[PDB]
Scaffold this active site. Structure first.
Site, PDB file in Angstrom:
ATOM      1  N   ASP B 290       0.832  -1.207   0.000  1.00 55.46           N
ATOM      2  CA  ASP B 290       0.000   0.000   0.000  1.00 55.46           C
ATOM      3  C   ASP B 290       0.864   1.254   0.000  1.00 55.46           C
ATOM      4  OD1 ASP B 290      -2.598  -1.084  -0.132  1.00 55.46           O
ATOM      5  OD2 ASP B 290      -2.606  -1.505   2.012  1.00 55.46           O
ATOM      6  N   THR B 291       1.962   1.236   0.752  1.00 58.79           N
ATOM      7  CA  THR B 291       2.839   2.406   0.800  1.00 58.79           C
ATOM      8  C   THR B 291       3.644   2.527  -0.487  1.00 58.79           C
ATOM      9  OG1 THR B 291       2.987   2.222   3.204  1.00 58.79           O
ATOM     10  CG2 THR B 291       4.681   3.569   2.099  1.00 58.79           C
ATOM     11  N   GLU B 293       3.583   0.856  -3.520  1.00 56.98           N
ATOM     12  CA  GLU B 293       3.010   0.776  -4.858  1.00 56.98           C
ATOM     13  C   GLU B 293       1.892   1.790  -5.067  1.00 56.98           C
ATOM     14  OE1 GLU B 293       1.890  -3.302  -4.808  1.00 56.98           O
ATOM     15  OE2 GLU B 293       3.647  -4.015  -5.955  1.00 56.98           O
ATOM     16  N   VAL B 296       0.113   5.758   0.310  1.00 55.51           N
ATOM     17  CA  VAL B 296      -1.071   5.826   1.174  1.00 55.51           C
ATOM     18  C   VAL B 296      -1.480   7.268   1.432  1.00 55.51           C
ATOM     19  CG1 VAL B 296      -0.583   3.601   2.285  1.00 55.51           C
ATOM     20  CG2 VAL B 296       0.228   5.740   3.349  1.00 55.51           C
ATOM     21  N   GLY B 297      -0.530   8.201   1.427  1.00 57.44           N
ATOM     22  CA  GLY B 297      -0.881   9.588   1.696  1.00 57.44           C
ATOM     23  C   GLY B 297      -1.810  10.171   0.649  1.00 57.44           C
ATOM     24  N   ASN B 373     -11.108  -1.593  -1.100  1.00 55.68           N
ATOM     25  CA  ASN B 373     -12.041  -2.088  -0.076  1.00 55.68           C
ATOM     26  C   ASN B 373     -11.586  -1.850   1.364  1.00 55.68           C
ATOM     27  OD1 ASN B 373     -10.135  -4.129  -1.140  1.00 55.68           O
ATOM     28  ND2 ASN B 373     -10.813  -5.293   0.665  1.00 55.68           N
ATOM     29  N   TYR B 374     -10.299  -1.595   1.582  1.00 52.45           N
ATOM     30  CA  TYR B 374      -9.766  -1.454   2.916  1.00 52.45           C
ATOM     31  C   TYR B 374      -9.571  -0.002   3.327  1.00 52.45           C
ATOM     32  CZ  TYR B 374      -9.081  -6.195   4.532  1.00 52.45           C
ATOM     33  OH  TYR B 374      -9.262  -7.505   4.939  1.00 52.45           O
ATOM     34  N   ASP B 375      -9.721   0.218   4.627  1.00 53.91           N
ATOM     35  CA  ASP B 375      -9.475   1.532   5.210  1.00 53.91           C
ATOM     36  C   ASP B 375      -8.589   1.339   6.425  1.00 53.91           C
ATOM     37  OD1 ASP B 375     -12.309   1.217   4.097  1.00 53.91           O
ATOM     38  OD2 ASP B 375     -12.230   3.401   4.139  1.00 53.91           O
ATOM     39  N   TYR B 376      -7.530   2.143   6.524  1.00 51.21           N
ATOM     40  CA  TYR B 376      -6.557   2.012   7.602  1.00 51.21           C
ATOM     41  C   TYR B 376      -6.400   3.343   8.310  1.00 51.21           C
ATOM     42  CZ  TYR B 376      -5.072  -2.143   4.973  1.00 51.21           C
ATOM     43  OH  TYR B 376      -5.031  -3.345   4.298  1.00 51.21           O
ATOM     44  N   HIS B 423      -5.244 -13.729   4.793  1.00 52.14           N
ATOM     45  CA  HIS B 423      -4.227 -12.755   4.403  1.00 52.14           C
ATOM     46  C   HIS B 423      -3.569 -12.194   5.659  1.00 52.14           C
ATOM     47  CE1 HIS B 423      -7.161  -9.598   5.540  1.00 52.14           C
ATOM     48  NE2 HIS B 423      -7.966 -10.587   5.215  1.00 52.14           N
TER      49      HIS B 423
HETATM   50 CU   LIG Z   1      -7.698  -8.219   6.861  1.00 51.58          CU
END
Ligand SMILES: [Cu+2]
Ligand SMILES: [Cu+2]
Ligand code: NA
Lengths: 620, 620
Positions: B290-291, B293, B296-297, B373-376, B423
């Protein structure tokens, strides 16, 4: 009306009257423990019989007694004479603490040891500590305390700053005689004070902290009925209090639609041990069983609004018995409140355009106890999403010693000449499980790594394995952080909508367990603390992991003897016992008063619900 | 004034103009990354030189460039052409994501696959995912995305509930060519919806939650100056923001009396990998960096008062570049606030009669990102007692698949026919340490058990050992929860008042590291994720554990290449890299939207101060 209501002052007064009229509470008697008994197993239990269990000490040396009384019928149900050389001594009495310092102040050997150190006996405090069982055959059958000395320079001085190392005494608190005084040599008494309210030490107080105001303008979201029954955000439970265990949670259940689903029948911290790791003969016997030997509930603090508990607080004030059977209220001894807990769930979806955020919250049930130099906070948390969590907070003042010239491998230096011996704080949670009912089983779940090869050509696959614990002899388990090991408590007869057994997963912190040599006295008396997880078959009289009478019991009581019955636990009424603890190498920052450190565990639903249980939380 | 100030819209516009003037930013060019460079090592140095690093993509197929620009002097400092087949592709552009679904909608192989499943192409969403490096020779030197399909029944429908399993396509996003369409067979598309705002699924919303009001009547206790410099309760730091790493903390220091004492020079999450453990060929390539490729910012959310951040909030709105070099503001992308954090220290002393209670609080710096689909959520915490903590919060919608009729060892069932592959979510924290200055060392600390015998006759003693890591080749370490393993960063040239080196202790959560087979593509590309702790000698160009160009890059860069230099790290300028992560076996309760789960680490002072640093906290 509820059989799980807190003991009232009137009940304790009636117990006192029943004991006195039965001749069991003469002037030489003391109540060392008094508590209400839970109802025995029976889903059709209708006739309320409220019963109390009492341990009665005798200060003249007669054998103590275990008594069960019925306050409902006003009768004594049974009274058994105890053989303490066999089954252990009764808990330490608060009034026996003072005896130690007073007896030593007139003992010629004690005074000579102090005179050599030029210490005024009027300034020497003695910490009265539990004795354990070691090499001294003359102690079997006697109530012994051991004393370590600290100097108090003036009435408001912190004596913990001034340990008198090289000196220990043993005292028979019934015959009132000093059995041994051991002087291994003169150590300088550390001179710096540790007075954390002295402006000379604190410096000017900060003026930079602005207030944080936490209020609930419409009141809290939970209700309290019948004195101690809680309903909050689909949770339902009863908050008990026992002078030995402290706060006990009963009947933890979750309202899922129109069904009240049980989860935990009874949750408590059933023992906590503080073993010291200094091999000096002055301290190598030192092990506190704060729950079993001292009774943590009787030293609960009154908690002050705005300081100990912040927000919209509802208090309970439990009642306990004093040593003569009089009721004593612990005013504001239990705080209850809800707290905001950040984001619960969040997603911004590109394809649907819907942005969704919900906030989490938790119900907090807490109390705080003080045992000598240490203070412990016990926190139970219920979360919106079904998670249950326990947290212990350790603070207070570390136990001190001299720091030897040349250093030490078992003691930290905190200040010039001042040491703090290495030790642990180990807790046992007793979880009488009731996942959707009483037919439960435990599985151990490990991560499974897979090798690159056929069916896994890219080497990316991983999996997991579950192992059912079917008998008590195979239900003594260790942690394995490296394989992500957790334990699942499931009900094989209650399935979710995917036809899988409903369950809850226990997540441990995987801290080190008891470090002492396996052949040591402490390893035999605190055997529970050598393994992370135990599972037993429920039985009415298997209450504590260390047995009923921990004080000066030679070892093996509790969990090792329960497990030895090797009973079926595969789809049965079972109890999970989780060991967890802190290993404390004191640091300079722990002195002169220690910032809180924490340890705990949590349980999360694992296919218990048919989907997320917080879809009906509003946005606000 | 401050060289660590956030990038301004004006600076980004000036970079655009400088690149245009130099002939580097014509119509066919796109900015894939732009960020400010930190000052090189050297106090004072070049009075003020704000330099930016830029990755420039060319949509016509020409080689991309890495460019460094000085906005202060208006000059290009260096521009180098990149050979992406060797050193890696640039990060994915937001505009390439849209290309994938459009190209597939006109490809006859894709349409044939959908017609075979009776699916209408207008309702099929394609998730465009990073490609990695596998067996496909035609992909070398090309920018590839892979697409997985989901059905959206209507515009507000959650497409994640309807995966189209058995189907994947690969797309060259520069030449606009569909390279391969792989169809391994028809799976039923799961039919239940997952619309967590649909009243039919949520039921009636709760009316039981009463408001919790958190206010600060006098405002917050921290000050913000120069746009991003924070002072709070003796802490001093600068809050940076980078489009790749997100929030970055600079110059973390603590005011100890008259001295500003450095602790951490730069703290960031320098990489995050999400590897999937399903060996199906449809998903066995799936790994998100995520960072590295995606950056994330770039996908940081705007955080709304009262929902995302509760209390008295101070916002930062960082500025980033779009693909053409225009400044783009992320309005309210960073929340800052202080929070009550319970009891700090507490003791009720019998002998002195003094009762003492103080409350803790923490400063929170957070942002939230959404990738598909993901939120961090990324949370940095500073505590009164000197503790520094990081916490990641994972939520969003789990990535789905079909659930195969015969079960699976690598996929959880969430709903009828609906699966969720296993995962991990693994983070790398890069901590450029500066404990009391730049001369630091790392020691590994293990508990030591001792056997009963001479000098330990009662078998109670235990100890610890510290091992100095002196060179990079010995500084690749693994967790050992059973022995209580931690790492201490100390400064051997700066001693506390007991003549011990000042230090900070790193406490890990000891979760499993990367599970993939060591010979897999992901284990080579995410080598950092196979070990818990790495220590390197500081170097300007060693920024990320995976190297500069992660997208479609094989192994060869990043931490394993850095440590091969085997540099001296014993009392030197060093960087700690800590791996930590979650292993996710999805549960039914994670569906249709996942409650937050968390992971992190913390650092606590270890003889850094001469006594507790919170003796001057007032009672209020
Ligand atoms: Cu998960
Ligand atoms: Cu401790
Ligand atoms: Na450094």
């Amino acid at each position: 009306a509820s059989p799980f209501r807190l003991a009232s002052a009137g009940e304790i007064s009636e117990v006192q009257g029943i004991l006195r009229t039965a001749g069991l509470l003469g002037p030489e008697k003391r109540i060392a423990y008094l508590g209400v008994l839970d109802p025995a197993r029976g889903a059709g239990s209708e006739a309320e019989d409220r019963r109390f269990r009492v341990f009665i000490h005798d200060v003249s040396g007669a054998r103590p007694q275990e008594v069960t009384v019925s306050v409902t019928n006003g009768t004594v149900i049974s009274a058994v004479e105890l053989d303490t050389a066999a089954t252990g001594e009764l808990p330490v009495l608060e009034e026996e603490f003072e005896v130690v310092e007073q007896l030593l102040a007139t003992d010629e050997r004690w005074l000579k040891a102090l005179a050599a150190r030029n210490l005024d006996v009027s300034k020497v405090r003695v910490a009265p500590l539990s004795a354990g069982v070691f090499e001294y055959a003359e102690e079997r059958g006697r109530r012994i305390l051991r004393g370590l000395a600290f100097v108090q320079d003036f009435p408001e001085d912190s004596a913990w700053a001034h340990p008198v190392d090289g000196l220990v005494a043993y005292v028979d608190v019934v015959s009132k005689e000093v059995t041994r005084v051991i002087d291994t040599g003169v150590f300088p008494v550390p001179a710096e004070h540790g007075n954390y309210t002295d402006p000379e030490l604190t410096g000017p107080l900060r003026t930079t902290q602005k207030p944080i105001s936490i209020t609930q303008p419409e009141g809290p979201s939970f209700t309290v009925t019948g004195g101690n029954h809680i309903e909050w955000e689909k949770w339902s439970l009863d908050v008990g209090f026992d002078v030995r265990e402290g706060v006990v949670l009963h009947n933890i259940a979750f309202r899922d639609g129109d069904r009240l689903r049980p989860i935990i029948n009874r949750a408590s911290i059933a023992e906590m041990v503080v073993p010291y790791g200094d091999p000096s003969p002055i301290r190598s016997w030192q092990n506190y069983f704060d729950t079993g030997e001292y009774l943590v509930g009787q030293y609960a603090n009154s908690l002050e609004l705005g300081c100990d508990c912040l927000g919209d607080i509802t208090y309970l004030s439990p009642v306990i018995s004093d040593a003569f059977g009089n009721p004593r209220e612990i005013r504001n001894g239990i705080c209850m409140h809800e707290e905001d807990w950040g984001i619960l769930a969040k997603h911004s979806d590109l394809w649907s355009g819907i942005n969704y955020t919900r906030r989490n919250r938790r119900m907090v049930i807490s109390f705080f106890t003080t045992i000598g130099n240490y203070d412990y906070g016990f926190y139970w948390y219920l979360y919106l999403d079904g998670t249950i969590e326990f947290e212990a907070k350790a603070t207070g003042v570390v136990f001190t010693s001299a720091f030897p010239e040349g250093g030490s491998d078992n003691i930290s230096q905190l200040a010039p000449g001042l040491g703090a011996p290495f030790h642990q704080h180990i807790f046992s949670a007793r979880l009488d499980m009731a996942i959707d009912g009483f037919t439960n089983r435990v599985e151990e779940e490990d991560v499974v790594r897979q090798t690159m090869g056929p069916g896994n050509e890219r080497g990316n696959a991983f999996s997991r394995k579950r192992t059912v614990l079917t008998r008590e002899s195979e239900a003594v388990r260790e942690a394995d952080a490296r394989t992500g090991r957790t334990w699942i408590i499931s009900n094989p007869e209650s399935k979710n909508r995917l036809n899988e057994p409903v369950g809850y997963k226990l997540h441990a912190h995987n801290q080190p367990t008891l470090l002492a040599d396996p052949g040591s006295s402490i390893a035999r008396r605190a055997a529970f603390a050598t393994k992370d997880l135990w599972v037993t078959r429920y039985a009415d009289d298997e209450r504590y992991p260390t047995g009923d009478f921990v004080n000066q019991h030679s070892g093996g009581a509790g969990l090792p003897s329960y497990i030895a019955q090797d009973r079926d636990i595969d789809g049965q009424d079972i109890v999970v016992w989780h060991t967890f603890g802190l290993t404390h190498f004191p640091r300079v920052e722990d002195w002169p008063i220690m910032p809180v450190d924490t340890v705990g565990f949590k349980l999360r639903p694992e296919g218990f619900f048919d989907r997320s249980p917080v879809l009906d939380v509003p946005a606000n």
